[PDB]
Write a protein that binds this ligand. Structure first.
Ligand code: A1AVR
Ligand code: K
Ligand code: K
Ligand code: ZN
Length: 609
């Protein structure tokens, strides 16, 4: 098992800049790299990463995605003066050249290949390449949009050639549309390319009709190119998360990529002069976290855009924070996506439904408390105090009047919760219990007693659990076998077999996560009554809430389920996964029941009365 994150950066890619007046290219400055790395240094993130050195991409590696005529023309630019460089730059659109840019372009490409080699050789779990110039706009025989060579298209073709990868997922969250990547893998069904981008009904650069939602791919690649056009500026965190939940993640998990490559352009963040969006840098901590269960965590984040020399460093730090497994920050104020974003999401879902059936529509980190003497990852530890025992005796004499082991388990619940909420010494925990009712009441009430306003309960089992949801401070997601209808607005009951896994995955991405993210709980309470081999992806993705503070209760000892739950809470890589009509009908009925209160469930524009 690989560990650690690779950080590939070199100050040499800062040794080229614009040498003439060009208001279109004035934003792409060398200070973008320096501010980024210095931000990672100030927060101590760069030191926690393995600094894999950069290298030059060879001529054959560059020819994987570019023609010999274009490579030879760029190869001649190191010998040009400023006048010849300006004329050469004028031959292309929205790009400038420099005596050192060909060198730096080969360094940006090689740095990306170094990142791919590091992740694929299991030398690191994931990694980021702070490179310059960006790449996602450059095409086979043209420089375009500040880009010389397509570093991400290099990574995918390099991974296919040198690792026999059949499925790669490219996620381009740069605010511009990487048309170079789309062109490269237009007919390629092995490289699924997703891209949201400021479009404004084709009025924004690069002003391409094939940047619209209607471009799904050509030939055998139909359905493996997904464009989400933002037609209004000011897209928020809710717009981005709705894009992931209702477009990207369901297709990504069904695709099951063997490698995830991120065209990480942070011009889609708040404050950037080009994107003009309103997504906080914290959203990128979640954008990568929601993708980390894919490809066993093998993620290659590659820098593209981002031109606000303040939000860029903050967004880079948030992305590295999540790559290192640090607890994701809580996102508040989430709600429905705006009408323009819902229109875009609905349009891309409809056109992609012919290729992904889930879009069709009707007309110490972890503390472990096993049973006494059960007898563990290096970032885990075991478990009482005088105040804990006195509180347990008070709860017993008050509510549970008239067993030493169960009372000991309740004391473990209290100590684990006190160590999770009242300090940063422990992030999450898992406890094996016997009596469910008493343990659930103690966990929930003590969690609400300590500073935890809202609690997201995730109970997998049948029967009614002692948890009142008619107050707003608790939301119950119950994965059961029998149907209990759905009355309370604070209760999402799902009663989903072979397709059960996929149905649960669809219900997790399209219902559970949007509700949980808008709910923004201070603690997640997982309960499993005595199939559940999707718990790892559930536990990993549910850790995006409450700064990862999750307490799991397991009724009955299951060495497989206990080890899986501890592995997921500790942050180890999640193994990949490789849909009944009654299940999707029950899911959409639950959506129609709850989307009025939880607008993040909406993937279609609402029809007014
Ligand atoms: N509006 C200027 C412009 C033109 C082309 C590309 C870009 C990027 O930012 C690419 S990341 C900006
Ligand atoms: K994009
Ligand atoms: K494709
Ligand atoms: Zn961009």
């Amino acid at each position: 098992a690989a560990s650690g994150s690779a950080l590939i950066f070199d100050e040499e890619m800062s040794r080229y800049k614009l040498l003439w007046t060009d208001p279109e290219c004035e934003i792409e400055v060398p200070e973008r790299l320096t501010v980024s790395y210095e931000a990672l240094r100030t927060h101590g993130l760069a030191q926690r990463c393995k600094a894999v050195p950069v290298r030059q991409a060879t001529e054959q590696e560059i020819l994987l995605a570019h023609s010999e005529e274009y490579l030879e023309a760029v190869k001649q630019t190191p010998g040009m003066n400023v006048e010849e460089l300006m004329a050469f730059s004028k031959k292309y659109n929205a790009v400038y050249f420099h005596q050192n840019i060909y060198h730096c372009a080969k360094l940006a490409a090689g740095a990306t290949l170094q990142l791919v080699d590091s992740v694929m050789k299991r030398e690191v779990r994931n990694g980021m390449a702070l490179v310059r110039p960006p790449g996602h706009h450059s095409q086979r025989s043209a420089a375009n949009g500040f880009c010389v060579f397509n570093n991400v298209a290099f990574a995918a073709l390099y991974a296919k050639k040198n690792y026999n990868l059949n499925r790669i997922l490219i996620v381009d969250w740069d605010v511009h549309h990487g048309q170079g990547i789309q062109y490269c893998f237009e007919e390629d069904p092995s490289v699924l390319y997703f891209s949201w981008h400021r479009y404004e009904h084709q009025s924004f650069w690069p002003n391409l009709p094939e940047s619209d939602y209607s471009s799904v791919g050509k030939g055998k690649g139909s359905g493996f190119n997904i464009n989400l056009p933002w037609n209004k500026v000011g897209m928020t965190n809710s717009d981005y998360l709705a894009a992931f939940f209702h477009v990207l993640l369901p297709v990504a998990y069904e695709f099951d990529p063997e490698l995830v490559i991120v065209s990480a352009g942070f011009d889609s963040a708040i404050g950037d002069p080009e994107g003009e969006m309103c997504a906080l840098p914290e959203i990128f901590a979640h954008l990568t976290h929601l993708l980390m269960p894919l490809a066993a965590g093998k993620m290659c984040v590659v820098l593209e855009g981002g031109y606000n020399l303040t939000s860029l460093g903050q967004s880079v730090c948030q992305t590295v924070h999540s790559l290192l497994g640090d607890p994701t920050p809580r996102i508040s104020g989430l709600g429905t996506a705006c009408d323009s974003a819902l229109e875009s999401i609905q349009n891309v879902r409809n056109v992609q439904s012919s290729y992904w059936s889930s879009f069709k529509h009707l007309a110490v980190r972890t503390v472990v408390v096993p049973p006494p003497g059960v007898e563990l990852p290096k970032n885990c530890q075991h478990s009482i105090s005088e105040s804990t025992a006195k509180e347990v005796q008070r709860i017993r004499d008050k509510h549970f009047h008239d067993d030493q082991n169960i009372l000991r388990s309740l004391g473990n619940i209290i100590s684990v919760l006190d160590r999770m909420m009242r300090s940063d010494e422990v992030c999450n925990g898992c406890v094996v219990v016997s009596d469910l009712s008493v343990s659930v009441q103690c966990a929930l009430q003590h969690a609400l007693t300590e500073p935890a306003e809202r609690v997201l309960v995730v109970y997998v089992g049948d029967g009614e659990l002692p948890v009142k949801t008619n107050d707003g401070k608790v939301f119950l997601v119950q994965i059961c076998t029998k149907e209990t209808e759905d009355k309370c607005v604070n209760r999402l009951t799902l009663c989903l077999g072979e397709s059960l896994t996929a149905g649960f995955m669809q219900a997790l991405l399209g219902l559970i996560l949007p509700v949980a993210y808008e709910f923004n709980p201070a603690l997640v309470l997982g309960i499993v009554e005595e199939l559940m081999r999707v718990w790892g992806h559930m536990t990993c993705l549910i850790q995006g809430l409450a700064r990862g503070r999750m307490l799991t209760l397991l009724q009955g000892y299951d060495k497989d389920l206990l080890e899986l739950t501890v592995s997921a809470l500790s942050g180890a890589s999640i193994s990949p996964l490789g849909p009944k009509p009654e299940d999707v009908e029950m899911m959409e009925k639950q959506r129609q029941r709850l989307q009025e209160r939880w607008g993040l469930l909406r993937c279609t524009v609402s029809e007014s009365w």
